[PDB]
Symmetry: D2
Subunit: 256 residues, 4 copies
């Protein structure tokens, strides 16, 4: 156990940067390795079992790099791979399903939105009873196009959420990209608590790591980006989502 | 050369079905082998060289199934892989770039819409001079979500097409999915001639195969579907676009 | 923990059956999964980092079959992957390098033979001080061709072992196949103790698994064989070295 | 066609250098790209269909480097991939099976030796009627260990060619490596004509290439080596077999 060692964070691409941001705020002294698998993004439409192999390869790559814990920022990969991945690895492994589904248990009727893979996996029903679940394929490309406040978002939010229970008290945003869309989602489902996977998970990570004596007390934390697709494209994309990408290098899928 | 043998048509997923339909209308006596690489869709944001390897892998698989010709129904893969793929292979190879550009050469000011990869590839500039070109990433998810007749489609067309020159006489629909948004594109840009990649390629295919004595003068045509991801998801998506998918089988990326 | 779960054992091919037989004797009630990577055999000429990815891939595969412990029967793959693989996984992980090196420390001057990769790795010098090491590439094929009792084996043993120190007291048989060549090796190196990787490891596995309470207590144990190459070829090659294979199925490299 | 373009030659490893050497002696002004797939050597124990994907992949790679012709120096790979590879590609494609079988048709009772995959392909029987065929697995490592002049080479030659008919007039040396064993093979089978795949193929390539008007008339020939395994290990092994490797670099299997 070396608290000077970095924390691994991985995603299919830029969406998981919402998780990275929340982690860095609570843990400014830590070193993060953010792995964006942009050569194979998106996971949301791939067979769950293929994502599970992706997650295993990427966990292996992060351990090779020496991380002390792994945060699976993707909801699709969390659904596909956890809890087994945490049950198979020695370093702590954290996901974005359980923390938000835990908080959700203090409400009478809970709904879920996420990718096609996420809602069909049954990952969330394993931790919490769901009144309603619905795949929102367009949210991700709406967010990546920078249209989170544009009227089209709103109409699309209405198309996906029109048919949903009026007594829902909370809604799980079971996709890394969905925090950008609280505005259009709040507007169509007023009064409903919106559960953010990123903030809920980073808190869990911070609590658990300190509890194990693995947080780094001293020093000034940094972030390195590792992507399997084009780095310049990723840098552009990350910026459209308000993240200044400083350090990026391309990781070959042969290194996997 | 054996005219009883089938025609290979391949795409990243369901989009290339527009090409498949135009072909089946002109050549009802041909057997088609339609390959949808849904395990690795989309191509439009991947590195152009990676798509080139995809095209070569699938081209080889189709040659091992016995096809007498190959239609590359994806605009991204055509940009990535043609003309070399046709130069390197003995069977006739056709793409969806050159026929639409060729028709485009009979207007004075010509514009292009397509995927990210396509507009950046320079493939279309090779064949016709372009006044304006714009990637339309939301269009593909809009079509796959079944919303081409919804007013959000009308709004998205405006977000992408407003700031294109008023003196366009023609617009190249440089993506397999765009013939579905012909109404919305036509409304936001009245008067401009819309060039359909699928209709113009199918004609080029039929003309040339005829010229070579390769058409199958007798018998009833059949279509077989071959995909790399989940077949049942594929069939659902295909049916939302108007193809009743009769035969579908899953092909391993190990077979490539 | 679940003591009904099987034990995973993996190798590049049939060599690891020497380790499996030793395991069978000490643990007749245990259910075993033997994973033979015959699509990618042999490991001895490949880069150590490539083998290391193989070990990770297969370890992940065995975990998905539910194994409660993993034995790395290949000496080349132990050299590539241990001790990190054991440090990184929750289940007990055992190799064929450490146990023979432990026993070898009760000798004054010790030598090592094995594959090209094993000798270059420096895996063995990390556990025991070595007086001599020689790669013996032809020894593996001699065993698989069934020539271990034949004179040509004896001349080949002399060719590799001529310039070995006359005062050696022990020789590490650092390759799964080398137990078949004890006759020819002792003839060229009389009076030298031959340290058998397979016999020592099964004891360690048995001791360690007994201690963790993971030993199965009821039941007749079988072995299931999983291979990445042609199963019938594997079946025929295993029989030539004295193993009767009953259950063998081909596992695709894409499941990895 | 471009006559300044290089000729492509590929093999699993160093065995194909016998073919390269013969080629360079006949075509000293030609530029050659030698591709040795040392990350996946040997082919002889693999499923023939897997080798066939290898041939396709590497052929695509060489076409992307711009070769004007391809020589498949491996007898296993010719058996797996020819004649189809030659039918499906525009560049001239040459193998090592057909030329040696053609010369063999000038004899009454003809034998063949080679790898397990080569004799099991039945590729040689498509071109010449065979009286006798034997796989000789140990010949390849004998050559790679530098033991072709050693007496085990005489003993091993005798082991594999003992039941061979005494009325056999010719033997096809159906493996790239076996010309180094001409000495032992002729000694153990006196009076039998030995048909060398390498010398006969180069003749055919030079004949065919001049006829297509593709020879490069000006220039000093060089060879560049491309390997998928470790380049220094390859260079060492090429030096043991008498080839002086000037330029070698490693190509990733993901580039394939």
């Amino acid at each position: 156990k070396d608290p000077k060692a970095p924390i691994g964070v991985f995603d299919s691409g830029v969406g998981g940067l919402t998780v990275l941001k929340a982690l860095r705020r609570l843990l400014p002294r830590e070193e993060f390795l953010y792995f964006g698998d942009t050569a194979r993004v998106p996971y949301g439409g791939k067979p769950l079992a293929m994502v599970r192999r992706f997650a295993w390869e990427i966990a292996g790559f992060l351990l090779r790099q020496g991380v002390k814990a792994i945060v699976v920022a993707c909801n699709t990969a969390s659904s596909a791979a956890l809890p087994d991945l945490a049950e198979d690895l020695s370093v702590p492994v954290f996901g974005v399903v359980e923390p938000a589904a835990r908080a959700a248990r203090g409400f009478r009727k809970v709904g879920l939105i996420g990718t096609q893979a996420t809602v069909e996996s049954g990952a969330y029903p394993r931790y919490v009873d769901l009144a309603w679940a619905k795949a929102c394929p367009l949210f991700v490309p709406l967010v990546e196009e920078g249209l989170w406040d544009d009227p089209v978002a709103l109409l699309v939010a209405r198309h996906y959420l029109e048919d949903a229970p009026k007594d829902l008290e909370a809604l799980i945003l079971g996709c890394t990209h969905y925090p950008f869309l609280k505005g259009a989602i709040g507007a169509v489902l007023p009064g409903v608590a919106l559960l953010d996977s990123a903030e809920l998970t980073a808190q869990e990570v911070a609590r658990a790591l300190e509890a194990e004596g693995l947080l780094n007390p001293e020093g000034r934390g940094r972030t390195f980006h590792l992507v399997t697709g084009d780095p310049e494209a990723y840098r552009a994309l990350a910026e459209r989502l308000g993240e200044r990408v400083e350090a990026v290098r391309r990781v070959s899928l042969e290194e996997l």
